[PDB]
Amino acid sequence: EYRKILRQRKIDRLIDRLIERAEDSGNESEGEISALVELGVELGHHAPWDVDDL
């Protein structure tokens, strides 16, 4: 923010956290973890990932 953006790319860490959770749970819990991601797809990735930009 103060140092011209870049402070954004911090979120990229989520990918690392996402994979650990599977390892950190015991039974992984894909239905809870993987299926969570699917929710993003149904609304058309509120983010610019729908390819068509929703």
PDB file of N, CA and C in Angstrom:
ATOM      1  N   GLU A   1       0.863  -1.214   0.000  1.00  0.00           N
ATOM      2  CA  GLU A   1       0.000   0.000   0.000  1.00  0.00           C
ATOM      3  C   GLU A   1       0.887   1.249   0.000  1.00  0.00           C
ATOM      4  N   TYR A   2       1.696   1.433   1.057  1.00  0.00           N
ATOM      5  CA  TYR A   2       2.583   2.608   1.115  1.00  0.00           C
ATOM      6  C   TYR A   2       3.694   2.478   0.079  1.00  0.00           C
ATOM      7  N   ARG A   3       4.212   1.262  -0.074  1.00  0.00           N
ATOM      8  CA  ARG A   3       5.283   1.000  -1.033  1.00  0.00           C
ATOM      9  C   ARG A   3       4.704   0.524  -2.359  1.00  0.00           C
ATOM     10  N   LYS A   4       3.854   1.354  -2.956  1.00  0.00           N
ATOM     11  CA  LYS A   4       3.229   1.030  -4.227  1.00  0.00           C
ATOM     12  C   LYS A   4       2.857  -0.452  -4.318  1.00  0.00           C
ATOM     13  N   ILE A   5       1.583  -0.748  -4.072  1.00  0.00           N
ATOM     14  CA  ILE A   5       1.056  -2.109  -4.161  1.00  0.00           C
ATOM     15  C   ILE A   5       2.106  -3.141  -3.726  1.00  0.00           C
ATOM     16  N   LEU A   6       2.117  -4.323  -4.360  1.00  0.00           N
ATOM     17  CA  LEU A   6       3.046  -5.394  -3.975  1.00  0.00           C
ATOM     18  C   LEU A   6       2.573  -5.988  -2.661  1.00  0.00           C
ATOM     19  N   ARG A   7       2.130  -5.134  -1.736  1.00  0.00           N
ATOM     20  CA  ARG A   7       1.639  -5.642  -0.462  1.00  0.00           C
ATOM     21  C   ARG A   7       0.437  -6.556  -0.716  1.00  0.00           C
ATOM     22  N   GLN A   8       0.014  -6.625  -1.982  1.00  0.00           N
ATOM     23  CA  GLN A   8      -1.109  -7.480  -2.364  1.00  0.00           C
ATOM     24  C   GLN A   8      -0.640  -8.932  -2.470  1.00  0.00           C
ATOM     25  N   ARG A   9       0.341  -9.159  -3.346  1.00  0.00           N
ATOM     26  CA  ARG A   9       0.898 -10.497  -3.602  1.00  0.00           C
ATOM     27  C   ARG A   9       1.071 -11.327  -2.317  1.00  0.00           C
ATOM     28  N   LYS A  10       0.864 -10.705  -1.163  1.00  0.00           N
ATOM     29  CA  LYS A  10       0.983 -11.413   0.106  1.00  0.00           C
ATOM     30  C   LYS A  10       0.004 -12.592   0.147  1.00  0.00           C
ATOM     31  N   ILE A  11      -1.215 -12.371  -0.346  1.00  0.00           N
ATOM     32  CA  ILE A  11      -2.234 -13.421  -0.355  1.00  0.00           C
ATOM     33  C   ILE A  11      -1.755 -14.711  -1.059  1.00  0.00           C
ATOM     34  N   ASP A  12      -0.803 -14.610  -1.995  1.00  0.00           N
ATOM     35  CA  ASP A  12      -0.367 -15.786  -2.751  1.00  0.00           C
ATOM     36  C   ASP A  12      -0.070 -16.932  -1.791  1.00  0.00           C
ATOM     37  N   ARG A  13       0.237 -16.582  -0.555  1.00  0.00           N
ATOM     38  CA  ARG A  13       0.536 -17.566   0.478  1.00  0.00           C
ATOM     39  C   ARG A  13      -0.627 -18.552   0.677  1.00  0.00           C
ATOM     40  N   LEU A  14      -1.853 -18.145   0.384  1.00  0.00           N
ATOM     41  CA  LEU A  14      -3.024 -18.998   0.565  1.00  0.00           C
ATOM     42  C   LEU A  14      -2.804 -20.358  -0.053  1.00  0.00           C
ATOM     43  N   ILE A  15      -2.140 -20.413  -1.198  1.00  0.00           N
ATOM     44  CA  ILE A  15      -1.922 -21.693  -1.862  1.00  0.00           C
ATOM     45  C   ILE A  15      -1.174 -22.645  -0.931  1.00  0.00           C
ATOM     46  N   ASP A  16      -0.191 -22.106  -0.216  1.00  0.00           N
ATOM     47  CA  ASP A  16       0.599 -22.903   0.719  1.00  0.00           C
ATOM     48  C   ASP A  16      -0.257 -23.387   1.889  1.00  0.00           C
ATOM     49  N   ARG A  17      -1.114 -22.504   2.389  1.00  0.00           N
ATOM     50  CA  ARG A  17      -1.994 -22.829   3.503  1.00  0.00           C
ATOM     51  C   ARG A  17      -3.035 -23.871   3.093  1.00  0.00           C
ATOM     52  N   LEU A  18      -3.513 -23.740   1.864  1.00  0.00           N
ATOM     53  CA  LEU A  18      -4.532 -24.642   1.337  1.00  0.00           C
ATOM     54  C   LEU A  18      -4.047 -26.093   1.312  1.00  0.00           C
ATOM     55  N   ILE A  19      -2.820 -26.306   0.856  1.00  0.00           N
ATOM     56  CA  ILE A  19      -2.272 -27.659   0.766  1.00  0.00           C
ATOM     57  C   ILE A  19      -1.934 -28.248   2.139  1.00  0.00           C
ATOM     58  N   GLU A  20      -1.484 -27.408   3.064  1.00  0.00           N
ATOM     59  CA  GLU A  20      -1.133 -27.893   4.399  1.00  0.00           C
ATOM     60  C   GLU A  20      -2.354 -28.469   5.108  1.00  0.00           C
ATOM     61  N   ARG A  21      -3.476 -27.771   4.995  1.00  0.00           N
ATOM     62  CA  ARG A  21      -4.698 -28.183   5.676  1.00  0.00           C
ATOM     63  C   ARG A  21      -5.045 -29.643   5.390  1.00  0.00           C
ATOM     64  N   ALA A  22      -4.801 -30.107   4.173  1.00  0.00           N
ATOM     65  CA  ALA A  22      -5.091 -31.502   3.865  1.00  0.00           C
ATOM     66  C   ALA A  22      -4.230 -32.390   4.742  1.00  0.00           C
ATOM     67  N   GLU A  23      -2.954 -32.037   4.810  1.00  0.00           N
ATOM     68  CA  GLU A  23      -2.006 -32.762   5.638  1.00  0.00           C
ATOM     69  C   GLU A  23      -2.356 -32.553   7.097  1.00  0.00           C
ATOM     70  N   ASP A  24      -2.790 -31.334   7.417  1.00  0.00           N
ATOM     71  CA  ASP A  24      -3.166 -31.003   8.792  1.00  0.00           C
ATOM     72  C   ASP A  24      -4.672 -31.154   8.978  1.00  0.00           C
ATOM     73  N   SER A  25      -5.110 -32.349   9.362  1.00  0.00           N
ATOM     74  CA  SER A  25      -6.526 -32.606   9.580  1.00  0.00           C
ATOM     75  C   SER A  25      -6.701 -34.041  10.057  1.00  0.00           C
ATOM     76  N   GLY A  26      -5.963 -34.942   9.415  1.00  0.00           N
ATOM     77  CA  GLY A  26      -6.003 -36.370   9.745  1.00  0.00           C
ATOM     78  C   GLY A  26      -6.676 -37.153   8.627  1.00  0.00           C
ATOM     79  N   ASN A  27      -7.942 -36.836   8.380  1.00  0.00           N
ATOM     80  CA  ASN A  27      -8.712 -37.489   7.324  1.00  0.00           C
ATOM     81  C   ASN A  27      -8.801 -36.566   6.115  1.00  0.00           C
ATOM     82  N   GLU A  28      -7.855 -35.630   6.036  1.00  0.00           N
ATOM     83  CA  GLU A  28      -7.822 -34.657   4.948  1.00  0.00           C
ATOM     84  C   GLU A  28      -9.102 -33.831   4.946  1.00  0.00           C
ATOM     85  N   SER A  29     -10.215 -34.451   4.558  1.00  0.00           N
ATOM     86  CA  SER A  29     -11.508 -33.767   4.534  1.00  0.00           C
ATOM     87  C   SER A  29     -11.682 -32.964   3.232  1.00  0.00           C
ATOM     88  N   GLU A  30     -11.593 -33.663   2.102  1.00  0.00           N
ATOM     89  CA  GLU A  30     -11.718 -33.020   0.791  1.00  0.00           C
ATOM     90  C   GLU A  30     -13.081 -32.367   0.663  1.00  0.00           C
ATOM     91  N   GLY A  31     -14.112 -33.099   1.051  1.00  0.00           N
ATOM     92  CA  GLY A  31     -15.465 -32.584   0.978  1.00  0.00           C
ATOM     93  C   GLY A  31     -15.538 -31.202   1.622  1.00  0.00           C
ATOM     94  N   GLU A  32     -14.784 -30.995   2.696  1.00  0.00           N
ATOM     95  CA  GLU A  32     -14.784 -29.698   3.368  1.00  0.00           C
ATOM     96  C   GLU A  32     -13.787 -28.732   2.714  1.00  0.00           C
ATOM     97  N   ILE A  33     -12.623 -29.265   2.345  1.00  0.00           N
ATOM     98  CA  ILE A  33     -11.545 -28.471   1.761  1.00  0.00           C
ATOM     99  C   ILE A  33     -11.679 -28.262   0.243  1.00  0.00           C
ATOM    100  N   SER A  34     -11.624 -29.351  -0.519  1.00  0.00           N
ATOM    101  CA  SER A  34     -11.696 -29.240  -1.979  1.00  0.00           C
ATOM    102  C   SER A  34     -13.016 -28.618  -2.407  1.00  0.00           C
ATOM    103  N   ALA A  35     -14.094 -29.170  -1.887  1.00  0.00           N
ATOM    104  CA  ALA A  35     -15.439 -28.716  -2.206  1.00  0.00           C
ATOM    105  C   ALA A  35     -15.642 -27.235  -1.860  1.00  0.00           C
ATOM    106  N   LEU A  36     -14.815 -26.698  -0.966  1.00  0.00           N
ATOM    107  CA  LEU A  36     -14.921 -25.281  -0.614  1.00  0.00           C
ATOM    108  C   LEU A  36     -14.586 -24.434  -1.840  1.00  0.00           C
ATOM    109  N   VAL A  37     -13.558 -24.869  -2.564  1.00  0.00           N
ATOM    110  CA  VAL A  37     -13.103 -24.178  -3.767  1.00  0.00           C
ATOM    111  C   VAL A  37     -14.206 -24.150  -4.823  1.00  0.00           C
ATOM    112  N   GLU A  38     -14.958 -25.241  -4.914  1.00  0.00           N
ATOM    113  CA  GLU A  38     -16.027 -25.340  -5.900  1.00  0.00           C
ATOM    114  C   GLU A  38     -17.016 -24.191  -5.732  1.00  0.00           C
ATOM    115  N   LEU A  39     -17.237 -23.767  -4.495  1.00  0.00           N
ATOM    116  CA  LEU A  39     -18.172 -22.680  -4.238  1.00  0.00           C
ATOM    117  C   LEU A  39     -17.778 -21.443  -5.044  1.00  0.00           C
ATOM    118  N   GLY A  40     -16.478 -21.183  -5.150  1.00  0.00           N
ATOM    119  CA  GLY A  40     -15.995 -20.035  -5.913  1.00  0.00           C
ATOM    120  C   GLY A  40     -16.405 -20.145  -7.386  1.00  0.00           C
ATOM    121  N   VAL A  41     -16.341 -21.369  -7.910  1.00  0.00           N
ATOM    122  CA  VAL A  41     -16.687 -21.636  -9.308  1.00  0.00           C
ATOM    123  C   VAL A  41     -18.168 -21.341  -9.601  1.00  0.00           C
ATOM    124  N   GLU A  42     -19.054 -21.783  -8.711  1.00  0.00           N
ATOM    125  CA  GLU A  42     -20.505 -21.608  -8.920  1.00  0.00           C
ATOM    126  C   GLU A  42     -20.947 -20.136  -9.106  1.00  0.00           C
ATOM    127  N   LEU A  43     -20.349 -19.191  -8.377  1.00  0.00           N
ATOM    128  CA  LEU A  43     -20.698 -17.773  -8.511  1.00  0.00           C
ATOM    129  C   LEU A  43     -19.940 -17.149  -9.694  1.00  0.00           C
ATOM    130  N   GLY A  44     -19.095 -17.940 -10.384  1.00  0.00           N
ATOM    131  CA  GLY A  44     -18.341 -17.412 -11.519  1.00  0.00           C
ATOM    132  C   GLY A  44     -17.079 -16.712 -11.056  1.00  0.00           C
ATOM    133  N   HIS A  45     -16.398 -17.318 -10.090  1.00  0.00           N
ATOM    134  CA  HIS A  45     -15.176 -16.751  -9.557  1.00  0.00           C
ATOM    135  C   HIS A  45     -15.288 -15.246  -9.424  1.00  0.00           C
ATOM    136  N   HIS A  46     -15.795 -14.775  -8.294  1.00  0.00           N
ATOM    137  CA  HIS A  46     -15.929 -13.334  -8.093  1.00  0.00           C
ATOM    138  C   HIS A  46     -14.645 -12.644  -8.553  1.00  0.00           C
ATOM    139  N   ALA A  47     -13.552 -13.426  -8.566  1.00  0.00           N
ATOM    140  CA  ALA A  47     -12.252 -12.951  -9.032  1.00  0.00           C
ATOM    141  C   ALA A  47     -12.107 -13.150 -10.522  1.00  0.00           C
ATOM    142  N   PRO A  48     -11.163 -12.511 -11.149  1.00  0.00           N
ATOM    143  CA  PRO A  48     -10.949 -12.638 -12.627  1.00  0.00           C
ATOM    144  C   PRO A  48     -10.526 -14.055 -13.088  1.00  0.00           C
ATOM    145  N   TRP A  49     -11.030 -15.136 -12.447  1.00  0.00           N
ATOM    146  CA  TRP A  49     -10.638 -16.505 -12.875  1.00  0.00           C
ATOM    147  C   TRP A  49     -11.688 -17.179 -13.777  1.00  0.00           C
ATOM    148  N   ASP A  50     -12.905 -16.639 -13.833  1.00  0.00           N
ATOM    149  CA  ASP A  50     -13.952 -17.222 -14.665  1.00  0.00           C
ATOM    150  C   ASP A  50     -13.558 -17.177 -16.140  1.00  0.00           C
ATOM    151  N   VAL A  51     -12.380 -16.616 -16.420  1.00  0.00           N
ATOM    152  CA  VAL A  51     -11.877 -16.496 -17.785  1.00  0.00           C
ATOM    153  C   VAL A  51     -12.683 -15.470 -18.574  1.00  0.00           C
ATOM    154  N   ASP A  52     -14.005 -15.563 -18.496  1.00  0.00           N
ATOM    155  CA  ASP A  52     -14.874 -14.627 -19.205  1.00  0.00           C
ATOM    156  C   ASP A  52     -15.140 -13.405 -18.336  1.00  0.00           C
ATOM    157  N   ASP A  53     -14.453 -13.340 -17.198  1.00  0.00           N
ATOM    158  CA  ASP A  53     -14.621 -12.228 -16.270  1.00  0.00           C
ATOM    159  C   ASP A  53     -16.082 -12.108 -15.859  1.00  0.00           C
ATOM    160  N   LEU A  54     -16.728 -13.254 -15.682  1.00  0.00           N
ATOM    161  CA  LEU A  54     -18.132 -13.279 -15.286  1.00  0.00           C
ATOM    162  C   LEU A  54     -18.977 -12.462 -16.262  1.00  0.00           C
TER     163      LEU A  54
END
